[PDB]
Every structure is written in structure tokens, then in C-alpha cells.
Subunit: 210 residues, 3 copies
């Protein structure tokens, strides 16, 4: 039964910055898998990096397992976008008679949920824009502004987002996607950790036989 307790908020002794995300969550519509961590700058909670997240819009932030999320990473949800049909000025916010110009959901340029897969490495000070989907095993370069979807096992960076490269061949990627090591039982993961780390996919497929 090796490995840390995923219910541990601070799984590293002496370290007051790095947090397992899941057991810190208190707000709704934030769904984060076990072992995924946030390496905070100064002890701030992961939740406070999630911005413009309003119940009435009801968009969700979804993050898988074994993700590495760097310090200062922020998640921009759908509340951040104004109506763009005419004036972008949010008259309704100021009330005093203007509250009747409250936008309907259909009026807003909603983009849907932010969905981050498993085993994703997000660099320092990354900004994630509304509705973005990030595939399994992707790597987001430091200081990136993720303005569009990211394919699984690809490396991207920049502002706006640029494609850097695929981590592996298309065939190897499909093998990792078929395997889904993150969904294996922890006992199986533990026994297979050397191959998960060194990327020996062919070996994992053999252990795959049972």
C-alpha cells in the first residue's frame, strides 16, 4: 500500500505549499481526481485560482488524476465574458433601473466546461480560458495562455497558444490511451511504476495480460 494518502491536503512533510487538490475542494462544480496536485506559490488554495465561476452559469471545472498543476495557474470560467452583440458594457451590474438589461444565458457567449484529462502537466503561471479541453498526458508550457483545445500527449505553449510537438508517435499515443494506467488499481499502478515512468509502453502491454 505504498504511496501517499490522496486525502492528505499536505502530503509532503515540511512542505506547506504543495497540496493535493481534491481534499481541499469546498465549492461546487469543481471536480478533481485523486493525486492531482497544486504547487501553490504561498499556500493559497487551488479553488481561489478558479475565477469568474458563477452558480447561475453552472459551468464546471473538471480535472482528472495524477495531474501536475504549477504555481499561479488560473482558470478563467464563463462569467468572464461580456455580451458582444452590441455594447460590451455590463449596464445591468449597476442596477438603479438598469437591472432589467440582465443578459439571458442565450445572450452570453458561453463556451462550456473546462475539461482537463489525466496525467497532465501544467506549467507555472498558465492561464486557462473558458471551455478549453485538455487531453490526457498533455504538457502546457510555463506562461502559456490556453486559448484553444489541446490534443492528448501534445506539448503546447505561448500567448496565444501554439502547437509545439506530439510527445510520441500516433501509434504509441493510442496505446497509452487504450491502457489508461491512471484508472488501474493502485496496487497494479505501484507494481508497474517503473514502466509508467520510463515510458516502456510495450512492457506495460504485456503486464496488460491479466
Amino acid at each position: 500500500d505504498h504511496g501517499p494518502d490522496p486525502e492528505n491536503i499536505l502530503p509532503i512533510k515540511g512542505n506547506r505549499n504543495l497540496q493535493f487538490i481534491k481534499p481541499t475542494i469546498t465549492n461546487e462544480n469543481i471536480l478533481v481526481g485523486e493525486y492531482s496536485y497544486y504547487d501553490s506559490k504561498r499556500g493559497e488554495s487551488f479553488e481561489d485560482q478558479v475565477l469568474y465561476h458563477y452558480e447561475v452559469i453552472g459551468d464546471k471545472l473538471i480535472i482528472g488524476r495524477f495531474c501536475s498543476i504549477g504555481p499561479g495557474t488560473t482558470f478563467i470560467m464563463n462569467g468572464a465574458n461580456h455580451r458582444m452583440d452590441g455594447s460590451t458594457y455590463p449596464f445591468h451590474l449597476f442596477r438603479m433601473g438598469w437591472e432589467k438589461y440582465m443578459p439571458s444565458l442565450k445572450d452570453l457567449p458561453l463556451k462550456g466546461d473546462i475539461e482537463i484529462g489525466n496525467d497532465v502537466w501544467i506549467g507555472r503561471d498558465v492561464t486557462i480560458m473558458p471551455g478549453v479541453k485538455i487531453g490526457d498526458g498533455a504538457i502546457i508550457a510555463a506562461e502559456a495562455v490556453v486559448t484553444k483545445n489541446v490534443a492528448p500527449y501534445s506539448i503546447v505553449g505561448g500567448n496565444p497558444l501554439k502547437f509545439i510537438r506530439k510527445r510520441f508517435s500516433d501509434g504509441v499515443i493510442e496505446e497509452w490511451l487504450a491502457l489508461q494506467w491512471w484508472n488501474l488499481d493502485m496496487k497494479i499502478i505501484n507494481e508497474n511504476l517503473p514502466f509508467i515512468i520510463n515510458g516502456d509502453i510495450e512492457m506495460l502491454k504485456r503486464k496488460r495480460k491479466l
Copy 2:
């Protein structure tokens, strides 16, 4: 009808969102009514204006009904070093080096930052010296504005990239001719439904011009 533009904190229970105009204390900054800054921590809009020096005499001008996102910063002309030879600012250190004080003519001055009306500036935008941003423009979050921005266009990136024009050229000229932001508030209130949904055709009719 509508809020008081002289009220610093026009949203009940909100201590971050400020009407900018009544917070201005400095010369060489002009901001139009109803334009607001949604601060991160309650910092003032003036705290976001950097390298702005009286001796340089550059100005920051912002129109009416602008939306300015958290952490937006305005870089004025004091930020640039002399570039004819070494960029090192010897004069700062005195002890004999003060006689190398630069002339304003020796500096790469870019002029005023001028932002139009009904402009929406995203979170954490950086605006570089001498930039002009036209009416109705939209600046994407985290953008670094390094060149002028055409009216009613959307832009973003570092360096700044053109994303798209919001409307057709003909429509844009209609908005620029209309200038609803300069109308009396009584007339604005009457036309708010169309100002908001962009029914420029109704707005034209409602104006009742010498057609």
C-alpha cells in the same frame, strides 16, 4: 436613471469594482464617465499607471463606458531607456554621472496612450507607451498591446495579434457616426435595448436626423 458616475463604489457590497473618474487625483490622466476598473484587491486605477512622469508630459486618456479588467497596467514613457549607445542609465547613480542626464529629445518617446469609448479590456492586459485603442475595441485577456487597435476590433496575444473585426465596415462607421456614449443620459436610457443588442438600424431611425 442608472448609477451615479461620481460614485466610486457603485455596486452594493462590491469593494473591488470602481468608477475610475472620481478616483483620479493625478494630472495628465483623463477618464470618461461610467468607465470602470475591477480591481483585484481594491487597488486604485492610478496604481496601475506606471512610469508616468510629469516632466515627460505624456497623457493617459480613456473614453466613456469602458470596462477595464483586473491587473491591467498602463506603461507610460518613463519605462524606456536611451538606445543610441549603451542602455545603462548611468545618470541615476550620480557621484559624477549625473551630468549624463538624458534630454527628452534623446529618449524614444511614443506619445500618449489614448483609449476610446465602449472599450472592453480583459484581465491582466499590458498596454505599452503611445498606443491608441479605437472605440468599441475588445482586448483579450493577458494581451500585450504593442501597436494601435482599430475601432470595433478584437485583438490579443503577446505580441498583439489581430483576431477579427466585430462588425462589417459599414456597420462600424454607423456606430462611429452615432457616438451613443456622448449622448445625453436621457437619450441613452431610451435607447439602451438597442445599444445592448446592437440593433444599429433602430438606433439610426430613433435619432431622427436630417435624413
Copy 3:
């Protein structure tokens, strides 16, 4: 004449601008005289050097007379994860996982960060591992330096883009042959007017004189 390069705070009223070299307490950080960091709040230059681990042994090297803007950060080689398989750093959590501590040969190490002399680094610049920046370069504000920078060039953006060369190739070669930053301070002072106003012809005649 000029300030004492051992003075941490060489400007009288100023609590933010620090000469870097005398503040350095760490190993593997080598910074030349007169190079300064104009801090945001008051932090130290070393606070801006991140993921710098003795076990990696990489070095941050900065020449003389560099101007480093506020919020500039230096990302050392400790910031990169192993990329052969999962990027997840199991070893950090121990409880049995300490066995999987990665070795140096399994890491994507990029080498030392090396910044030349007379380099101007703008506000809020990020410097990635293994980057080399040549003498006299200028790094635009908010840039993310993702690759090497030629001497006497201007670059900016995220990722980094080439803007332009500061001078003609012939002039750049003359500045590089000159290396004024390496001359004795008596000679520096004597030639400060020409170093500052970019009179490279004069500097060249002066150099030929005592060669």
C-alpha cells in the same frame, strides 16, 4: 567617479533598485559589477531565481552593466519533469515512492542561463533554462525568453520573436571588439559620453590609440 559597485542601495531615495552582485548569497549565481535589479516591492534578486538546486549544479551567469526590470524571473533546470513516460513526480511524495528518484541523465537539462554585458531586460520577463543572451541585447517587457538571443538585438513576445538588430552588422562588430564593460573604470569614465551617445567611431579611434 560613479557609485560603489559594492553598495546594495546606490540611489539615495531608492529602496527598490539594488546592485545585484553584493546581494548574492548563493552558489552558482555569478553576477558582474554595476548590474542592477529594480525590484517591484522590495524583493531580492535571488528571490527571482527559481528551481535552482545545488544537486543539479546549473549556473546563472550575468555580465556587467545589465539592467534587469521588476518581476523578471529566472527559471532554472529544476522546473522540468521527466518526459519519457508520465510527467508525474512520484518520488516527491515518498511513502515508498522515493525509490523512483530520477537521475540527471533522465532529465531534460538545458544547461546554464548566460546573460552577457550591457543587457537591458524589461519588466516581468521570464527566462527559461539554458538560454544564452548576447551582449547589448534588449528584452521587451513581458517577454518569455524561450531561446537564445543574438547580441545587440531586440526581441520580445511569448514565445520569443525577433524584432530587430539594434545596429548594422559592422557597428555591432565594433561594439563587440570594443567590450567597453571590460575596460578599467578610469577609461570607462573617460569614454562615458561616447558610450552613452553611441559615437562608435570615436570609441574605435580611442581604442586604436592605446592598443
